[PDB]
Amino acid sequence: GPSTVQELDLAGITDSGLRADYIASSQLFRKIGRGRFLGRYMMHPAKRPYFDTFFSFVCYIDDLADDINLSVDVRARRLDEWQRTYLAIAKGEDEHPLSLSEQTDAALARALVHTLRTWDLPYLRVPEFVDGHRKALTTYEYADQEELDDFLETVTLLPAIWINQIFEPISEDAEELCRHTITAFQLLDFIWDLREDLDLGRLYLPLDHLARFGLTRADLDRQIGSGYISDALRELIQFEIDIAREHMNAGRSWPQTLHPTARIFMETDIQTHDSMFPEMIKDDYAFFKSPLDFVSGRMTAKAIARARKANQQATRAGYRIRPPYR
Amino acid sequence: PSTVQELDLAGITDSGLRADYIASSQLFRKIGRGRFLGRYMMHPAKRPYFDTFFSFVCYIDDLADDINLSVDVRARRLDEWQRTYLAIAKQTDAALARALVHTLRTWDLPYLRVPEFVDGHRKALTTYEYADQEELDDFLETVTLLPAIWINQIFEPISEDAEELCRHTITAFQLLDFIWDLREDLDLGRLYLPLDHLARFGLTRADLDRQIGSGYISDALRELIQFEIDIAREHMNAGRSWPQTLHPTARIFMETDIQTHDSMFPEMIKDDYAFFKSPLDFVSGRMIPRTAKAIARARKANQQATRAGYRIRPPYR
Ligand SMILES: CC1=C(C[C@@H](C)O)c2[nH]c3ccccc3c2C(=O)C1=O
Ligand SMILES: CC1=C(C[C@@H](C)O)c2[nH]c3ccccc3c2C(=O)C1=O
């Protein structure tokens, strides 16, 4: 964009090879993150290379894990291939990527290592996130909350608490409010995608939550999208929504514990996910009874103008991003 | 107004067929990534057909383009989808295929020629540049214009001229896409501007690879870019009246699509082609205010069509 050179210059990212990897990672985020990419313009320009690269990493691994053209075994192999490339770059054994996928892997890895080391994040623990995705690929149900927490801690919350530091907290409360907020987002995703995930063979609601309402997995498979849900399924849906609400409410202060330059982004992201609640609930949970055809809370202009002012003011008040890793 | 209610309006009552349409519509929602967002402007009774057709084009495009698979594996997988389709024309693979067959037969389209579209993607897999317009035309004809002239029929033309206006318009959209996504296609190793157009200005692929997105472009590259833009704009101006040759229910869809693509030209040219000098920051297929308003006007125009007495195409059976 008209400000990409401004962004890399403000961050002090001047090596020509490193700049190219940041740009490649940002373009990959544009392509895969799509609407999420526009959130970059709620961030301070000097912060955007790191915001882009971190989101790019999470979105890209998601995309490998979700690619409908690959079997689960081929997805697991692609995750292994990315992890191998990442670790080699992280350890300085760097290989020489040949294929397009290998080149993409390596460019993201090089920018990511630099981003994580810039922010004193545990760059050598990235494989734990990847392992969590690889495990999720062959995990089709969760017996109880403890089992679901394994997925949430490794796939959802590990990267969340890392980007939380890039948001530059101003109070010690931030990590815990981060965990509640992103948990709520992730639980919202499970509820919203219930039909699709069930069609993929995956139940992200804990089996003992179904048991509490006398329901089996087969009950859910038959009813979601069927035209009819039972009273017991309505109460289970309401149960899971209430869990999401409580996490959203327990994390509501998160934006106020973040640097002013990250606050509008997360205020806007919270509002966007908040809009999922009435869409799933209204018209006696019509969302779950039929495949509905509508433009949802996503598929942001006002926020960007407010952010542009907030970012200019931050700079004039002496905001200075920390220097890039050498 | 749910997918179930749209299938009801279309008269599609077979339970297995309905489930196949629902699957094709869910797939389109999943993978579409903002392509064909005008789907929301179509008359609800026709959405099962449009969603199945778009799902088909998106799915094959994405499979051919997925660099998580080798080119050789993508050719095999394209070939396998081809053979499965034809076999059915006589698991999500079979659902899409059954819905596609039914959509195509409902509209008197040559449903047995679907493999020519798949096979054109198969051939482009191993093609990384085109010597001239003639070689590029071979690619346009099977991958781009073959499905365009089929969905044209589903738009219910009111004049034989629709097919030619369709060809002009979609050719302009496709050419525009090559220019707009030049940086990404180059990164993926694909040059969609014919080699002899480069030569006209003394340029090689290395020049484009070096300059696009670098902060600098040469006068020769400016000229090549304007040359390709002029070709696309010529097609856009020739095909622009296409909606006036379509049933009124299809007009806001294509009027808005034409207008959105027409918006791309000044974005690419303004400020001395700044578009080509830095990395792209545009996200395609988003629900901007313009589009939302169009969907609102289309809702009212589709209700007017029904009040005027719009007979729904009888589904194939
Ligand atoms: C930073 C961030 C994060 C943290 C991420 C970059 O690691 C996030 N994780 C999610 C899991 C499911 C649904 C939404 C999210 C999100 C966000 O929306 C978000 O802004
Ligand atoms: C019907 C249709 C079509 C016809 C397609 C459904 O066969 C189309 N082909 C394209 C190639 C490159 C960029 C845009 C298009 C489009 C459209 O935008 C469109 O509406």
XYZ file of C-alpha atoms and ligand atoms in Angstrom:
683
model
C 0.000 0.000 0.000
C 0.925 3.687 -0.092
C 2.459 3.200 3.370
C 4.279 -0.164 3.195
C 7.649 1.561 2.898
C 6.633 3.829 5.760
C 5.711 0.800 7.877
C 8.936 -1.142 7.303
C 11.033 2.030 7.717
C 9.301 3.007 10.959
C 9.936 -0.479 12.288
C 13.578 -0.311 11.250
C 13.285 -3.389 9.011
C 15.909 -2.386 6.421
C 17.662 -5.576 5.231
C 16.462 -6.146 1.701
C 15.975 -9.903 2.120
C 14.114 -9.535 5.411
C 11.869 -6.800 3.955
C 10.932 -9.126 1.108
C 9.968 -11.894 3.564
C 7.797 -9.495 5.564
C 6.077 -8.396 2.349
C 5.583 -11.994 1.234
C 4.110 -12.868 4.651
C 1.807 -9.838 4.465
C 0.619 -10.764 0.981
C -0.081 -14.310 2.112
C -2.146 -12.805 4.976
C -4.042 -10.616 2.487
C -4.928 -13.727 0.444
C -5.791 -16.099 3.318
C -6.790 -13.695 6.084
C -8.910 -11.595 3.684
C -11.123 -9.380 5.867
C -8.854 -9.901 8.884
C -6.011 -8.292 6.871
C -7.830 -4.932 6.991
C -7.406 -4.893 10.770
C -3.793 -3.938 10.078
C -5.043 -0.414 9.442
C -6.300 -0.201 12.994
C -2.692 -0.748 14.184
C 0.098 1.801 14.325
C 2.054 1.740 11.037
C 5.314 0.772 12.778
C 3.506 -2.202 14.359
C 1.988 -3.519 11.124
C 4.970 -5.666 9.908
C 4.755 -7.688 13.133
C 0.940 -7.768 13.253
C 0.908 -8.940 9.641
C 3.528 -11.621 10.167
C 1.972 -13.032 13.327
C -1.557 -13.174 11.910
C -0.133 -14.511 8.686
C 1.430 -17.404 10.647
C -1.779 -18.331 12.470
C -3.978 -17.983 9.351
C -1.549 -19.980 7.186
C -1.311 -22.923 9.568
C -5.132 -22.879 9.906
C -5.319 -22.947 6.093
C -2.978 -25.922 5.730
C -4.961 -27.723 8.428
C -8.286 -26.914 6.728
C -7.473 -27.361 2.997
C -10.330 -29.457 1.580
C -8.193 -30.597 -1.368
C -5.843 -32.523 0.966
C -6.633 -35.615 2.984
C -5.924 -35.459 6.706
C -2.714 -37.450 6.182
C -1.483 -34.980 3.563
C -2.393 -32.041 5.792
C -0.356 -33.578 8.631
C 2.563 -34.013 6.263
C 2.297 -30.353 5.148
C 2.322 -29.297 8.796
C 5.461 -31.451 9.270
C 7.017 -29.851 6.228
C 6.309 -26.343 7.530
C 7.642 -27.235 10.995
C 10.877 -28.663 9.461
C 11.450 -25.513 7.391
C 10.626 -23.310 10.369
C 13.007 -25.129 12.737
C 15.850 -25.054 10.229
C 15.492 -21.309 9.738
C 15.098 -20.849 13.500
C 18.323 -22.805 14.150
C 20.285 -21.271 11.291
C 20.578 -24.549 9.381
C 18.481 -22.887 6.656
C 17.959 -25.101 3.608
C 17.273 -23.882 0.043
C 13.559 -24.109 -0.728
C 12.738 -25.481 -4.172
C 8.974 -25.800 -4.608
C 6.484 -22.958 -4.314
C 5.101 -24.361 -1.078
C 8.644 -24.673 0.314
C 9.443 -21.093 -0.741
C 6.240 -19.828 0.901
C 6.999 -21.819 4.080
C 10.498 -20.383 4.305
C 9.588 -16.749 3.669
C 6.917 -16.864 6.380
C 9.285 -18.709 8.746
C 12.085 -16.142 8.252
C 9.772 -13.189 8.925
C 8.138 -15.051 11.816
C 11.397 -15.915 13.601
C 12.400 -12.289 13.300
C 9.013 -11.082 14.603
C 9.035 -13.447 17.587
C 12.638 -12.674 18.525
C 11.959 -8.920 18.199
C 9.247 -9.252 20.833
C 11.149 -11.688 23.071
C 8.587 -14.420 22.352
C 9.661 -18.126 22.632
C 10.332 -18.674 18.963
C 11.561 -22.255 19.594
C 8.137 -23.199 21.025
C 6.301 -22.598 17.705
C 6.242 -26.408 17.156
C 3.873 -26.755 20.141
C 1.277 -24.784 18.196
C 1.869 -26.846 15.102
C 1.685 -30.118 17.104
C -1.651 -28.932 18.522
C -3.037 -28.495 14.986
C -1.649 -31.847 13.887
C -3.284 -33.523 16.882
C -6.609 -31.721 16.276
C -6.629 -33.240 12.769
C -7.216 -36.763 14.177
C -9.227 -35.708 17.257
C -12.938 -36.037 16.443
C -14.477 -35.526 19.916
C -13.667 -34.304 23.423
C -14.990 -36.236 26.414
C -15.114 -33.298 28.814
C -13.756 -29.833 29.462
C -10.288 -31.074 30.399
C -9.924 -32.695 26.990
C -11.147 -29.614 25.141
C -8.691 -27.487 27.155
C -5.830 -29.409 25.510
C -6.971 -28.084 22.113
C -7.724 -24.597 23.504
C -4.370 -24.251 25.252
C -2.250 -25.368 22.300
C -4.163 -24.283 19.171
C -6.063 -21.217 20.439
C -4.454 -19.680 23.461
C -0.723 -20.235 22.962
C -0.519 -17.912 19.910
C -3.101 -15.583 21.507
C -0.876 -14.872 24.557
C 2.093 -14.269 22.229
C 0.360 -11.676 20.034
C -0.949 -10.178 23.273
C 2.631 -9.030 23.941
C 2.890 -7.513 20.501
C -0.239 -5.538 21.368
C 2.039 -4.060 24.122
C 0.098 -4.425 27.386
C -0.011 -1.546 29.856
C -1.281 -3.578 32.810
C -0.548 -7.019 34.183
C -4.204 -8.080 33.815
C -3.861 -8.244 30.033
C -2.871 -11.890 29.553
C -5.840 -13.230 31.482
C -8.317 -10.950 29.731
C -6.726 -12.018 26.454
C -7.320 -15.688 27.362
C -10.994 -15.078 28.204
C -11.688 -12.988 25.085
C -9.999 -15.336 22.607
C -11.586 -18.334 24.334
C -14.990 -16.690 23.748
C -14.124 -16.106 20.089
C -13.063 -19.721 19.709
C -16.166 -21.103 21.400
C -18.290 -18.861 19.191
C -16.584 -20.407 16.214
C -17.413 -23.925 17.439
C -21.124 -23.047 17.830
C -21.381 -21.157 14.527
C -19.626 -23.950 12.553
C -21.487 -26.785 14.304
C -23.113 -28.115 11.126
C -19.959 -27.907 9.030
C -17.760 -29.510 11.691
C -20.270 -32.274 12.316
C -20.258 -32.931 8.556
C -16.460 -33.201 8.818
C -16.911 -35.748 11.619
C -15.822 -33.368 14.400
C -17.722 -32.492 17.595
C -16.187 -29.535 19.415
C -18.792 -29.533 22.155
C -17.680 -31.682 25.127
C -19.548 -34.982 25.190
C -20.456 -34.517 28.832
C -22.171 -31.251 27.871
C -24.381 -33.285 25.536
C -24.910 -35.862 28.302
C -26.125 -33.158 30.668
C -29.128 -32.615 28.361
C -29.663 -36.286 27.519
C -28.315 -35.896 23.978
C -26.049 -38.029 21.861
C -23.783 -37.011 19.051
C -26.184 -38.755 16.660
C -29.019 -36.505 17.991
C -27.014 -33.440 16.957
C -26.005 -34.898 13.584
C -29.666 -35.573 12.761
C -31.153 -32.318 14.015
C -28.823 -29.439 13.111
C -30.044 -28.116 9.757
C -32.954 -30.617 9.675
C -35.728 -28.054 10.093
C -36.297 -28.987 13.736
C -34.457 -28.885 17.023
C -35.719 -30.437 20.253
C -36.096 -28.621 23.533
C -33.071 -30.488 24.872
C -30.944 -29.359 21.923
C -32.158 -25.778 22.373
C -31.033 -25.904 25.999
C -27.633 -27.303 25.001
C -27.208 -24.539 22.401
C -28.181 -21.993 25.070
C -25.742 -23.630 27.503
C -22.813 -23.264 25.108
C -23.723 -19.691 24.188
C -23.861 -18.842 27.890
C -20.339 -20.237 28.385
C -19.135 -18.054 25.505
C -20.940 -15.015 26.970
C -19.287 -15.504 30.364
C -15.817 -15.612 28.839
C -16.589 -12.556 26.718
C -17.793 -10.765 29.830
C -14.819 -11.928 31.905
C -12.465 -10.564 29.262
C -14.365 -7.323 28.400
C -11.659 -5.051 29.926
C -8.908 -6.436 27.638
C -8.711 -3.381 25.297
C -8.174 -0.996 28.232
C -5.101 -3.015 29.337
C -3.514 -2.693 25.901
C -1.487 0.123 24.450
C -3.794 2.826 22.982
C -2.500 1.918 19.518
C -3.957 -1.646 19.748
C -7.214 -0.738 21.518
C -9.432 0.046 18.527
C -8.443 -3.148 16.753
C -9.505 -5.296 19.684
C -12.577 -3.172 20.480
C -13.689 -3.707 16.881
C -12.875 -7.446 16.869
C -14.915 -7.910 20.052
C -17.902 -6.012 18.550
C -17.662 -8.133 15.406
C -17.781 -11.393 17.381
C -20.468 -9.948 19.650
C -22.678 -9.644 16.583
C -22.607 -13.470 16.216
C -24.745 -13.930 19.306
C -28.076 -12.394 18.115
C -27.659 -13.973 14.679
C -27.537 -17.485 16.165
C -30.293 -16.831 18.729
C -32.947 -14.880 16.884
C -36.159 -16.370 15.503
C -35.993 -19.274 17.998
C -32.480 -20.365 16.949
C -33.407 -20.519 13.251
C -29.619 -20.509 12.554
C -29.405 -24.125 13.774
C -32.662 -25.405 12.193
C -32.004 -24.618 8.528
C -29.046 -23.623 6.338
C -29.698 -19.881 6.474
C -28.782 -17.525 3.612
C -27.711 -14.125 4.943
C -24.915 -11.564 5.189
C -23.556 -11.965 8.722
C -21.680 -9.617 11.049
C -18.729 -9.816 8.646
C -19.919 -11.531 5.424
C -14.851 -1.309 9.992
C -14.532 1.962 8.083
C -15.300 4.127 11.129
C -12.673 2.329 13.247
C -9.900 2.979 10.718
C -10.485 6.752 10.736
C -10.491 6.745 14.535
C -7.314 4.628 14.464
C -5.585 6.987 12.030
C -6.117 9.825 14.517
C -5.096 7.636 17.465
C -1.901 6.554 15.674
C -0.864 10.097 14.776
C -1.455 11.182 18.380
C 0.515 8.244 19.811
C 3.527 9.209 17.672
C 3.251 12.858 18.716
C 3.103 11.798 22.385
C 6.421 9.915 21.968
C 5.400 6.421 20.924
C 8.546 4.635 19.726
C 8.313 0.975 18.790
C 11.117 -1.186 20.164
C 13.937 -1.914 17.701
C 13.909 -4.933 15.416
C 15.894 -8.043 16.238
C 19.360 -7.913 14.648
C -34.892 -16.753 3.192
C -33.049 -20.058 3.639
C -31.489 -22.484 1.158
C -34.427 -24.777 1.965
C -36.906 -22.058 1.012
C -34.943 -21.340 -2.203
C -35.093 -25.023 -3.225
C -38.838 -24.873 -2.488
C -39.281 -21.873 -4.806
C -37.276 -23.660 -7.528
C -39.572 -26.694 -7.345
C -36.751 -29.067 -6.427
C -38.527 -31.716 -4.330
C -36.435 -34.886 -4.592
C -34.824 -35.389 -1.183
C -31.447 -36.635 -2.445
C -31.272 -33.845 -5.003
C -32.134 -31.259 -2.324
C -29.332 -32.523 -0.080
C -26.888 -32.300 -3.012
C -27.883 -28.661 -3.642
C -27.508 -27.872 0.049
C -24.038 -29.430 -0.017
C -23.071 -27.454 -3.121
C -24.319 -24.237 -1.498
C -22.422 -24.948 1.747
C -19.268 -25.624 -0.270
C -19.621 -22.301 -2.113
C -20.123 -20.448 1.174
C -17.034 -22.187 2.562
C -14.534 -21.789 -0.308
C -15.959 -18.850 -2.232
C -13.831 -16.302 -0.364
C -15.814 -13.389 -1.730
C -15.976 -14.561 -5.335
C -19.421 -14.069 -6.912
C -20.662 -12.011 -3.979
C -23.440 -10.854 -6.312
C -25.018 -14.228 -5.484
C -27.038 -12.269 -2.937
C -28.579 -10.147 -5.735
C -30.044 -13.110 -7.655
C -33.691 -14.049 -7.584
C -34.089 -16.529 -4.685
C -35.754 -19.179 -6.889
C -32.614 -19.258 -9.055
C -29.983 -19.269 -6.322
C -29.701 -23.109 -6.167
C -28.615 -23.092 -9.804
C -26.290 -20.094 -9.461
C -24.747 -21.412 -6.239
C -24.123 -24.831 -7.781
C -22.510 -23.289 -10.881
C -20.308 -20.903 -8.858
C -19.415 -23.759 -6.472
C -18.301 -25.818 -9.461
C -16.136 -23.060 -10.971
C -14.629 -22.075 -7.600
C -13.891 -25.672 -6.637
C -12.107 -26.578 -9.880
C -10.212 -23.242 -9.944
C -9.020 -23.771 -6.342
C -8.006 -27.372 -6.947
C -5.969 -26.428 -9.998
C -4.389 -23.547 -8.077
C -3.547 -25.344 -4.768
C 0.259 -25.293 -4.414
C -0.016 -27.609 -1.432
C -0.245 -30.309 -4.133
C 2.252 -30.956 -6.885
C 1.262 -30.073 -10.440
C 1.279 -33.807 -11.238
C -1.052 -34.615 -8.362
C -3.411 -31.767 -9.329
C -3.589 -33.124 -12.908
C -4.496 -36.563 -11.567
C -7.060 -35.105 -9.183
C -8.587 -32.980 -11.951
C -8.697 -36.044 -14.167
C -10.359 -38.084 -11.394
C -13.002 -35.418 -10.811
C -13.605 -35.367 -14.608
C -14.147 -39.110 -14.795
C -16.388 -39.199 -11.704
C -18.478 -36.380 -13.162
C -19.031 -38.100 -16.499
C -19.796 -41.399 -14.789
C -22.501 -39.603 -12.808
C -23.703 -37.665 -15.829
C -24.583 -41.220 -16.959
C -18.386 -37.878 -1.525
C -18.736 -34.101 -1.781
C -17.380 -34.828 -5.274
C -20.476 -36.844 -6.159
C -22.833 -34.341 -4.522
C -21.406 -31.398 -6.485
C -21.475 -33.490 -9.684
C -25.129 -34.561 -9.260
C -26.236 -31.003 -8.527
C -24.165 -29.671 -11.442
C -25.628 -32.220 -13.877
C -29.155 -31.331 -12.763
C -28.451 -27.570 -12.962
C -27.007 -27.939 -16.447
C -29.812 -30.165 -17.727
C -32.439 -27.891 -16.216
C -31.145 -25.059 -18.441
C -30.614 -27.130 -21.638
C -26.798 -26.743 -21.337
C -24.386 -29.376 -22.813
C -23.787 -31.117 -19.501
C -21.512 -33.736 -21.105
C -18.957 -31.050 -22.094
C -17.970 -30.087 -18.515
C -14.720 -32.068 -19.067
C -13.564 -29.477 -21.607
C -13.434 -26.894 -18.793
C -11.665 -29.308 -16.440
C -9.222 -30.324 -19.177
C -8.376 -26.678 -19.907
C -7.354 -26.267 -16.283
C -5.404 -29.501 -16.610
C -3.442 -28.134 -19.592
C -2.802 -24.746 -18.009
C -1.156 -26.579 -15.077
C 2.000 -27.081 -17.144
C 1.794 -23.724 -19.013
C 3.751 -20.864 -17.430
C 3.652 -18.340 -20.292
C 1.894 -17.791 -23.607
C 3.779 -16.882 -26.768
C 1.036 -14.695 -28.219
C -2.643 -13.822 -28.195
C -3.421 -17.011 -30.114
C -1.999 -19.235 -27.364
C -3.682 -17.132 -24.689
C -7.030 -17.413 -26.546
C -6.853 -21.201 -26.336
C -6.659 -20.799 -22.553
C -9.410 -18.142 -22.356
C -11.756 -20.255 -24.490
C -11.822 -23.370 -22.296
C -11.146 -22.058 -18.817
C -12.880 -18.669 -18.983
C -15.400 -18.333 -21.789
C -16.819 -21.881 -21.908
C -18.434 -21.602 -18.438
C -19.360 -17.934 -19.008
C -21.465 -18.789 -22.053
C -23.177 -21.560 -20.033
C -24.103 -19.375 -17.086
C -25.266 -16.813 -19.657
C -28.141 -19.164 -20.488
C -29.088 -19.369 -16.792
C -29.300 -15.564 -16.850
C -32.235 -16.152 -19.311
C -31.197 -13.961 -22.273
C -33.838 -11.955 -24.098
C -31.646 -11.643 -27.205
C -29.163 -13.806 -29.072
C -26.740 -10.865 -28.672
C -26.260 -11.815 -25.018
C -23.694 -14.475 -25.890
C -21.364 -12.028 -27.648
C -21.746 -9.376 -24.951
C -21.052 -12.126 -22.385
C -17.845 -13.067 -24.199
C -16.681 -9.452 -24.367
C -17.501 -8.726 -20.734
C -16.002 -11.840 -19.189
C -12.903 -11.449 -21.375
C -12.509 -7.956 -19.922
C -12.935 -9.303 -16.350
C -10.354 -12.039 -16.955
C -7.824 -9.707 -18.582
C -8.375 -7.274 -15.693
C -7.678 -10.066 -13.233
C -4.327 -10.870 -14.918
C -3.246 -7.235 -14.670
C -4.553 -6.651 -11.120
C -2.967 -9.862 -9.710
C 0.214 -9.529 -11.751
C 2.481 -9.469 -8.663
C 0.962 -12.635 -7.167
C 0.873 -14.574 -10.447
C 4.524 -13.680 -11.109
C 5.376 -14.912 -7.595
C 3.647 -18.208 -8.451
C 5.675 -18.460 -11.657
C 2.786 -17.717 -14.046
C 2.948 -15.039 -16.739
C -0.489 -14.322 -18.217
C 0.592 -11.414 -20.438
C 1.587 -12.804 -23.844
C 5.336 -12.803 -24.440
C 5.051 -10.819 -27.665
C 3.315 -7.970 -25.808
C 6.363 -7.807 -23.523
C 8.645 -7.828 -26.586
C 6.659 -4.981 -28.151
C 8.121 -2.801 -25.367
C 11.545 -4.496 -25.129
C 10.624 -6.256 -21.879
C 11.348 -9.718 -20.463
C 9.677 -11.559 -17.629
C 12.700 -10.649 -15.455
C 11.849 -6.939 -15.883
C 8.324 -7.484 -14.540
C 9.514 -9.717 -11.734
C 12.100 -7.118 -10.727
C 9.911 -4.027 -10.954
C 6.293 -4.824 -9.934
C 5.870 -3.916 -6.294
C 9.457 -2.601 -5.971
C 8.614 1.098 -5.655
C 9.820 1.711 -9.234
C 8.543 0.916 -12.718
C 10.102 1.900 -16.039
C 8.442 3.785 -18.894
C 8.377 0.583 -20.978
C 6.530 -1.229 -18.181
C 4.102 1.704 -17.834
C 3.450 1.390 -21.569
C 2.970 -2.381 -21.406
C 0.551 -2.005 -18.501
C -1.436 0.687 -20.343
C -1.368 -1.484 -23.489
C -2.967 -4.415 -21.590
C -5.425 -2.098 -19.830
C -6.514 -0.669 -23.207
C -7.194 -4.174 -24.510
C -9.337 -5.015 -21.482
C -11.166 -1.672 -21.605
C -11.935 -2.178 -25.292
C -13.654 -5.457 -24.364
C -15.418 -3.825 -21.398
C -16.879 -1.072 -23.594
C -18.037 -3.557 -26.226
C -19.742 -5.867 -23.699
C -21.097 -3.264 -21.277
C -24.705 -3.445 -22.529
C -24.877 -7.214 -21.687
C -27.384 -6.709 -18.805
C -29.938 -5.084 -21.169
C -29.923 -8.424 -23.086
C -30.641 -10.431 -19.898
C -33.839 -11.109 -18.017
C -34.528 -8.251 -15.538
C -33.859 -10.562 -12.583
C -30.212 -10.905 -13.698
C -29.526 -7.229 -14.405
C -28.516 -5.738 -11.089
C -26.096 -8.647 -10.606
C -24.223 -7.960 -13.846
C -24.623 -4.165 -13.760
C -22.932 -4.106 -10.380
C -20.283 -6.652 -11.448
C -19.492 -4.579 -14.554
C -19.324 -1.424 -12.421
C -17.034 -3.043 -9.830
C -14.619 -4.215 -12.517
C -14.825 -0.824 -14.246
C -13.728 0.707 -10.926
C -10.476 -1.285 -11.184
C -9.065 0.704 -14.127
C -8.635 4.078 -12.377
C -7.364 2.309 -9.236
C -4.568 0.793 -11.318
C -3.711 3.926 -13.293
C -4.004 6.770 -10.789
C -1.009 8.552 -9.261
C 1.306 7.392 -12.073
C 0.432 3.679 -11.692
C 1.221 3.633 -7.966
C -0.824 0.385 -7.795
C 2.106 -1.442 -9.443
C 4.833 0.175 -7.344
C 3.968 -1.082 -3.834
C 2.431 -4.251 -2.360
C -1.291 -4.742 -2.881
C -3.450 -3.770 0.101
C -6.849 -4.557 -1.483
C -9.100 -7.380 -0.299
C -11.351 -8.618 -3.104
C -14.954 -9.640 -2.623
C -15.806 -7.701 0.527
C -19.248 -6.445 1.511
C -18.593 -2.713 1.035
C -21.468 -0.155 1.230
C -21.940 -0.071 -2.570
C -22.470 -3.845 -2.675
C -24.820 -3.937 0.325
C -26.975 -1.255 -1.301
C -27.044 -3.195 -4.584
C -28.259 -6.291 -2.703
C -30.980 -4.067 -1.234
C -32.085 -2.769 -4.650
C -31.991 -6.318 -6.061
C -34.277 -7.590 -3.282
C -36.883 -5.069 -4.453
C -36.308 -5.762 -8.154
C -36.708 -9.521 -7.645
C -40.014 -8.891 -5.836
C -41.147 -6.703 -8.749
C -40.324 -9.547 -11.152
C -42.479 -11.969 -9.154
C -45.383 -9.485 -9.074
C -45.096 -8.986 -12.836
C -45.550 -12.759 -13.207
C -42.122 -14.411 -13.395
C -42.458 -18.079 -14.412
C -39.725 -20.193 -12.800
C -37.852 -22.564 -15.057
C -39.239 -26.083 -14.433
C -36.461 -28.188 -12.872
C -35.126 -31.086 -14.906
C -36.765 -34.442 -14.222
C -5.493 -11.568 17.846
C -6.639 -12.516 17.564
C -6.410 -13.954 17.867
C -5.102 -14.499 18.422
C -4.393 -15.174 17.256
C -3.611 -14.200 16.360
O -3.471 -16.110 17.739
C -7.571 -14.909 17.573
N -7.594 -16.261 17.784
C -8.835 -16.668 17.399
C -9.459 -18.080 17.399
C -10.854 -18.223 16.900
C -11.634 -17.066 16.411
C -11.032 -15.699 16.431
C -9.582 -15.545 16.961
C -8.793 -14.434 17.050
C -9.051 -12.915 16.716
O -10.104 -12.507 16.251
C -7.913 -11.990 16.998
O -7.993 -10.813 16.794
C -20.833 -14.843 -14.029
C -19.382 -14.409 -13.871
C -18.282 -15.180 -14.567
C -18.562 -16.416 -15.419
C -18.232 -17.702 -14.649
C -19.348 -17.948 -13.625
O -18.113 -18.796 -15.545
C -16.807 -14.753 -14.396
N -15.643 -15.280 -14.899
C -14.608 -14.482 -14.438
C -13.076 -14.557 -14.680
C -12.197 -13.537 -14.007
C -12.781 -12.466 -13.167
C -14.266 -12.403 -12.952
C -15.160 -13.468 -13.641
C -16.509 -13.632 -13.603
C -17.636 -12.806 -12.880
O -17.307 -11.869 -12.216
C -19.086 -13.227 -13.038
O -20.012 -12.652 -12.516
